Design a protein around this ligand. Sequence first.
Ligand code: CLA
Ligand code: CLA
Ligand SMILES: CC1=C(/C=C/C(C)=C/C=C/C(C)=C/C=C/C=C(C)/C=C/C=C(C)/C=C/C2=C(C)CCCC2(C)C)C(C)(C)CCC1
Ligand SMILES: CC1=C(/C=C/C(C)=C/C=C/C(C)=C\C=C/C=C(C)/C=C/C=C(C)/C=C/C2=C(C)CCCC2(C)C)C(C)(C)CCC1
Ligand SMILES: CC1=C(C/C=C(\C)CCC[C@H](C)CCC[C@H](C)CCCC(C)C)C(=O)c2ccccc2C1=O
Ligand SMILES: [Ca+2]
Lengths: 31, 751, 80, 42, 163, 43, 139, 135
Amino acid sequence: MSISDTQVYIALVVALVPGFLAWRLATELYK
Amino acid sequence: EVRVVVDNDPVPTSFQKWSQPGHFDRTLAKGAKTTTWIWNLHANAHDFDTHTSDLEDISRKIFAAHFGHLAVVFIWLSGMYFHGARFSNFEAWMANPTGIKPSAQVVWPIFGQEILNGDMGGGFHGIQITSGLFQMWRAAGFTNTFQLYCTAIGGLVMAALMLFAGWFHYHKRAPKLEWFQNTQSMLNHHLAGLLGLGSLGWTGHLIHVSLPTNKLLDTGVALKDIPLPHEFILNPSLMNKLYPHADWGFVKGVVPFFTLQWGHFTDFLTFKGGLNPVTGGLWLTDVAHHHLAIAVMFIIAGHMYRTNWGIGHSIKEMLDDARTPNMLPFLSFIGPVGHKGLFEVLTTSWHAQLSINLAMLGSLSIIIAHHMYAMPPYPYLATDYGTVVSLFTHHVWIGGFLIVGGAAHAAIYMVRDYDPEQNFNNVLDRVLRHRDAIISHLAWVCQFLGFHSFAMYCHNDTMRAFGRPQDMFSDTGIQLQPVFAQWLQHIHTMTIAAPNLHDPVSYAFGGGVVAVGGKVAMMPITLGTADFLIHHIHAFTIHVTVLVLLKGVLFARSSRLIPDKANLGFRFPCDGPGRGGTCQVSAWDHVFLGLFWMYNSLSMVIFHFFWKMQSDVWGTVGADGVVTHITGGNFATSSITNNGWLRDFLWAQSTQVITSYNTSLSAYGLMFLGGHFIFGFSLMFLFSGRGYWQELIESIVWAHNKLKVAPAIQPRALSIIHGRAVGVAHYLLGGIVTTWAFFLARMTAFG
Amino acid sequence: SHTVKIYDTCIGCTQCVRACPTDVLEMVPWDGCRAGQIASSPRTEDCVGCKRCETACPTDFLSIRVYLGAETTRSMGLAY
Amino acid sequence: MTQLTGDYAASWLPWIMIPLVFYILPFPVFAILFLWIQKEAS
Amino acid sequence: NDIIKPFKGDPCLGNLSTPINDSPLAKAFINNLPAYRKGLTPFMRGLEIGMAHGYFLVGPEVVIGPLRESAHGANLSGLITAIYIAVSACLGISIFAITTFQGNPKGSYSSYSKDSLRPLRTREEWSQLNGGIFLGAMGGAIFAYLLLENFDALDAILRGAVN
Amino acid sequence: EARYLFRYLSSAPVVATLALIIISVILIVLNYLFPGLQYGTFF
Amino acid sequence: TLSGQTPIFGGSTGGLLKKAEVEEKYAITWTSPKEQVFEMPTGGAAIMRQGQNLLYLARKEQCIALGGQLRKFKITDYKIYRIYPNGETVYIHPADGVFPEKVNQGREKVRYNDRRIGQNPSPSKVKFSGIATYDAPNS
Amino acid sequence: NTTLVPCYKSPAFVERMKNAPDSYYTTKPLKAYSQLLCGEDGLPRIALDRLSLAVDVAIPIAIFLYTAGFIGWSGRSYLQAIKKQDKAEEKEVFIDVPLFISCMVMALFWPMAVIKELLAGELVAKDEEIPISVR
Ligand code: CLA
Ligand code: CLA
Ligand SMILES: CC1=C(/C=C/C(C)=C/C=C/C(C)=C/C=C/C=C(C)/C=C/C=C(C)/C=C/C2=C(C)CCCC2(C)C)C(C)(C)CCC1
Ligand SMILES: CC1=C(/C=C/C(C)=C/C=C/C(C)=C\C=C/C=C(C)/C=C/C=C(C)/C=C/C2=C(C)CCCC2(C)C)C(C)(C)CCC1
Ligand SMILES: CC1=C(C/C=C(\C)CCC[C@H](C)CCC[C@H](C)CCCC(C)C)C(=O)c2ccccc2C1=O
Ligand SMILES: [Ca+2]
C-alpha cells in the first residue's frame, strides 16, 4: 500500500512552511 | 666567393677544464654553493649561445658537437649489427621468415630473468625484437652473420673517424665564420653530394646486391646456393639467368645507359608499383628504380644555387624579391618589405635553422611512419604485425618530439636572436604585429573542433547508454561519411592519370588483398563514420598543440601582461603573483605544455592506428579467401563511443600484458606497471610547488644539523622550471612506457 | 591597490627602484644608512604586484614587502 | 516498457517538475541570480 | 602602398585596416546588416535580426532531431527549440540591458566610448531591441514551421501538381 | 696532462657511478650463493 | 599638454583597446637625435622620428618597458603622461622631473615602517580591528 | 602462531617441488626453503614465534643495521673531516678518496665509536647551535 494521491499534495503544502521559513532566515542573515 | 678558411690550433687539448666543471658559465665556475649548481651545470651544458657571444666560436662548437653525435649513432648502429651478428637467430630467420620469430638480445641467466628468453622457433631462446632490423637486412642482401659482424666492425671504425673529426675541427683546424655562413654552398652539396650521391650509391647496391640476392631468396635456395654479393660482380655471367634482357659486362653491359637504349634495363628497373606477393614488401626492382629517379632528381637539385662559378641562384635576393610589387594579387598583403632581412635571420642564428630543421624532420618522421605501413618496403615486414605497429609508433613519437623542439627554438630565436632592425615591416615582423588575430582564430578553431570531435563522442556515449543507437553518430545512426577522403580513395585506385602503374600502389587505397604467410600483409582500409570522427580528433589535438606552441612563439617577446618578457629570458618561472598571477608565462612554459599536447595527440594517433589495423586490416586468411581480423571489425561500431575505447580497446586488448606473468612476456607486464608508477610519480612535480618542498628540506636539514652531518652543498628544492621539467619528463616517460609495453605485449603474443 | 611597505633595514642599495616595472618606488633622503637613502612607495595604486622589487632587495629577509591586497583595474594590468 | 510512467501516487508530478526545476526554471533563476551579482552600489 | 593600414590612421589602436573589416564591399555589407543599418529604430533592428534567426533555428531539429523519424512531430520539436533558444536569448538581453546600463556603463557602452561596432548604447535603445528580437524570432520560427508542416502541400505548388 | 684527469676521475659522479658499478656484489654474490636467498635461508 | 609626431608604425593588434578611451590611457613622449628603430611594447617594431616623439600605450608598464628600452638608445629625456577620457593630461613619470633612482630633497618617507619586518605584530593583536598587522602603529 | 608449518610437512609446497624445472634457480634455493615456516599455500613466510627464530630475525637485522651505520658513519665522519679542513665547499664535489677510505676504516668499528661520541657529548649538536626558523 503506497501513500495516497492526496498525501503527496499534503506534503507539498507542508513543505511550503519551511520553504518560507528559509526565506525568513536567509534574508535575516542579510543576503 | 666560396672559400675554405680555417684557424690553426684555436683551442688547446688538455684536461684542465675537465677537473673544473661548469667552466662554460662564469656563474657556474665560481663554486657549488648549493645543489642548484649541480642542476644548472646540466641544463646549461649545451646552450653554447650563453657560453660565448661571438657566432664564430659558437658555430665551431655546433659543428664539432655534431661529429661527436654522429659518433654516438655509429656506436649504436654498430651495436645493432653486432647483436644481429652473434646474439640473434638471424641465420634461422633467413631460411624460414614466417615461422621463425626475429630475435636478438638474449638475456643472461641471473635473477630468474632467463624466463625472458622465450622460444623463437628453431630452438633459439631470446627476446622477440620489433625493430625490423631483420626485415631490413634481408632487403640489404645480408645472408650470413659474418657480413653483419664486419659491418659492426665497419661502424666502430667509422665512429672513431667521427670522434677524430670532431676533435680535429675544434682543436686543430676550426673553420672561421665565413666558412659557415655560405649556406648556399652547403645546400648544393647536401642536395647533390649527400642525398643525390647517397641514393645513387644505394641504387648501386640495390641492383648489384639486393636485387640478385632477393631474386634467389624468393625461389627458395636456402642460403647454400646464394652467392656472396661480390660473386655477382666477379662472375657477371651469374646475373644473366636473372634479368636476361641486359648484358652484364664491365664495359659491354653498361653502354646501354650511355647510348640511351634504356629498354634493356626494364627487367630490373621496373615500375610495377605494388607489393611483391611472396614477401609482402615492395618490389626491389621497383625500389631500385625509385632511388635512381631520386638520385637523378637530387643531383639536379644540387645545381640550383650559385657558388663561386657565377651560374646558379642566390637565396639572398630570391628572398629579397618576394616583396609586394611582385606577388599574386590575392597574397600581395605581405608588406612592401616582404622577405627582406630574412636571409640574415637564417644565416646569423642557429636557432632559426634548428627550429625549421626540427619541424621538418619531425614532420618527415610522421610522414615516413604513414608510408611504411601502407606500402611496406621490406620483405616480410607487413606480416610481422609487432614490427608494423612498433615502427609506426616509434616514428610518430620521434616525429612529435622533434616538432615540439622546432617550436622551442622558434621561441628561443625570438627572445635571444630576434633583431628588430633587420626585421622591420618584413614578413616576420608583420606576424608579431597581428599575433592576436592569429591566436584568436587558432583558439576558436581549437574550440570548434573540440566540440565537433570530442563532444560528438559524448553524444554517442549517451545515446548508446540511453538505448538510442539510431540517434548516435554511427554508420547505422546519423552517418558522417568522410566524403572527401572516400573520394581520394576512389581517385587513387582508378588511376592504375598515370597509366603505366598497372598494379595499384598502396593496397590500402583499394583493390586486392595480400596474404603472405596466411596473415594479411595489406588490405584496403575503408573509411566510415568512425574514421570521420577519429580524424577530427586528430585535427583537434594537432591544433591545440599548435595553439600552445604558436602562442609561446608569438608571445615570447612580450604580451599585454608583461611588455618586457624578452628581458626576463626564455626560461623563467613567472613574473610574480601580480596581475592576478603570471605563472608559466615564459616561452619555455609553452613548450612544457605543448609536450603534454603532443603526448595527447600522438597517443591518439597510435591508438587509431593500432585498433584500425587489428579490426580492419590485419588478420589471417583461410582456405577460401575470407579474412578474420584480429578484433573483427570492432573499430567501426565501438570506436565511436569513448566507452568503447575503454572496454573494446584498452580493457580488451590489454589482456596480453595483464596476463603476462610467468611467461616470456613477463617484462612487458613490469614495464606496463612501471609506466604507471612513473606517470603517477610525475604528478608530484606537476601538481605541487617548490615552496612546500623547500620548507620541507629545512625541517630535514635540521635533523642533519642536529647530528652534525649537514652538507656544505646546501640542499635546495628544485627550481620552479626544473620541477616542471621533471614533471613533464616523467609524465611522458611513464605514459609512453605503458603504451610501449601494451603494444608489444599484445603483438608479440600473436606474431 | 597593493601595499609596498619599506622597513628600516634598507641600505640604500637602490636596487628595488630599478626593478620596478611601473615606477612605484623612489628614493628619499634618510640618515639610517651610509647611503643616506631609503625606498619609499608614493605610487602604490600603480603597483602591479610583480614582487620584482623584493627579488632585488639584498638585505637578508628583505626590507620591502609587497602586500597583495584589493586588486583593481591597474593593479592587475589589464589593457582591456 | 516504452514510456516513462509511474506506479507511485501523483505520477503526473514528475512529468511537470523534472522539466520545471531543470530546464524551465533555471534560466529565470540564473537571470535573477545574475541581476543580484551585478548591481551598482550607488 | 601597403594594403594593410593602421586602423583609421592611428597606429596606436589595437586593430588593422584590413580587406576583411575595411573593404568597400565588406563595409557595405556589415554596415547595412540590421545591427548597423543607419536609419532603423531599435525595434526594426531586432525585428529583422530576430526573423532571420527564428527561421533557420527550426531546421537543425526537424531533420536530425529526436523526432525526425515521424513527420508531424518533427516540426513541433524544431519549432519549440527555436521558441526556447529565442526566449532564453531574449531573457539574456533583458538582463544584459539591466546590468550594463546603470549610470556609467563600464566598457564599450560608456558615454565617451565612440565605438562603431556596437551602437545601441542607451537602455531606451536596448528595450525596443529586445521586443524586436523576440517578436522577430517568434514569427520567423512560426513561418519556418508553417512552411515545413505544409511541405507536401508546398512541394506540390512549386512543382505544378496543383495544376 | 695526467694530474687534472685523475682529479676528474674522482670528482662527484664518477665516484658515484663507479660505486654503483663497484656495488655489483649483488650480481656476483647472488650468482653463486644459489641465487634464491630469503631471510630464513642464509646463515 | 602633449604633442609629438608618431613613429613610423604600420599599426598593430596589441595596441589600445576599449579601455584606452573609457578608463584612461598613457602617452610616452621622448626626443631622439637619430632616425632609428625600436621594439614596440605591443609587438612589432617602429621607427622613432627625428624630433619630438609621441606614443600612446594602454598601461603604465608598457611605457616604462619602452622607457627602459630608450635608455639603451642613450635617450633619458622621456616623459610619461596619463590621459583621462575627459581629456586632461597628468605628468606621472618622472614625477619630480628627475628619475626615481636619483634622490632629491623634499620627497617624503611614505609607507615606511620604523621597525624591522621581524617584529610586525601577530594577527591576533589586530583581531577584529580595521588595520592589518603591517600598518601597526606600534614601533 | 601454529597455522604455519615447516615446508617439510606442507602438501601445497611439495607440489611446488614436483613441477619445478632446474636451470639454476628452483632446486638449489628451493631445498633451502624447506626449513622455513610455510603457510597453507606452499609459500615461505616470515613469522615471529619465540627463540625458535630469535636468531634468524637477528641475522638480517644485525647485518643491515651494521652496514647501514657503516655507510652512515663513514659518510658522516668524512663530512666533519672536511668541515674542519675549511675546504668543505669543493671537498664535496670532488671526493677526496684517500680521506674517504680512511673514514671508512674508522667506520668498521662504528658501534663502539658512536658510544664514545655520545658519552663525550659530541655526537649531537646543542640546540642553540642549529640554524632554525622563527618559532
Ligand atoms: C681527449 C681528447 C679531448 C680533450 C682533452 C678535450 C678537452 C677540452 N675540450 Mg674537447 N672534444 C673532443 C676531445 C677532447 N677535448 C672530441 C673528440 C670532440 C668532438 C665531440 C670535442 C669537442 C669539443 C667542443 C665543442 C668543446 C670542447 C671543449 C674542451 C675544453 C673544455 C673541457 C670540457 O668540455 O669539459 C667537460 C668534460 C667532459 C669529460 C665532457 C664529456 C661529455 C661527453 C662528451 C658525453 C657524451 C657521451 C655521453 C656519455 C652520451 C651517453 C648518454 C647515455 C648515458 C644516455 C677542454 C680543454 C669546450 C671548450 O672549448 O671550452 C671553452 C668546447 O665547447 N671539445
Ligand atoms: C532535500 C531533500 C530532497 C531531495 C534531495 C529531493 C530530490 C528529488 N525530488 Mg523531492 N521532495 C522533498 C525533498 C527532496 N527531494 C520533500 C521534503 C518533498 C515533499 C514536498 C518533495 C517532493 C517531491 C515531488 C512532488 C517530486 C520530487 C522529485 C525529486 C527528484 C527530482 C528533483 C525535483 O524536481 O524535485 C523538486 C523539489 C521539490 C518538490 C521540493 C523539495 C525541496 C525540499 C523540500 C528542500 C530541498 C532544499 C534543500 C534542503 C536546500 C539545499 C539547496 C542547496 C544548498 C544545495 C529528486 C530525486 C520529483 C520526482 O519525483 O522525481 C521522479 C517530483 O516531482 N520531490
Ligand atoms: C553571409 C552571406 C551569405 C549567407 C547568408 C546567409 C547566412 C543566409 C541566410 C539566410 C536566412 C536565414 C534568411 C531568412 C529569412 C527569413 C524570413 C524571410 C522570415 C520571415 C518571416 C515572416 C514573414 C514571419 C511572419 C509571421 C509573423 C511575424 C508573426 C505571425 C506569424 C507569421 C508567420 C505570419 C552567402 C554566403 C549566402 C552570400 C551572401 C552573404
Ligand atoms: C627488535 C625487534 C623489533 C622491534 C623494534 C623496536 C620496537 C624498536 C625500537 C627502537 C627505538 C625506540 C629507537 C630509536 C631511536 C632513538 C634515537 C634518538 C635514535 C637514533 C639514532 C641515531 C643517533 C643515529 C645515529 C647514526 C648512526 C647510528 C649511524 C649513522 C649516522 C647516524 C648519526 C644517523 C621488530 C618487531 C621491528 C623486529 C623484530 C624484533
Ligand atoms: C619532490 C619534489 C622536489 C624535491 C626534489 C628533490 C630533492 C630531488 C631528489 C633527487 C635526489 C636528491 C638525488 C640525489 C642523489 C644523491 C647524490 C645520492 C647519491 C649518492 C650515491 C650515488 C652514493 C622539488 O624540489 C620540487 C620542486 C618543484 C615542484 C615539485 C617538486 C617536487 O615534487
Ligand atoms: Ca532518430
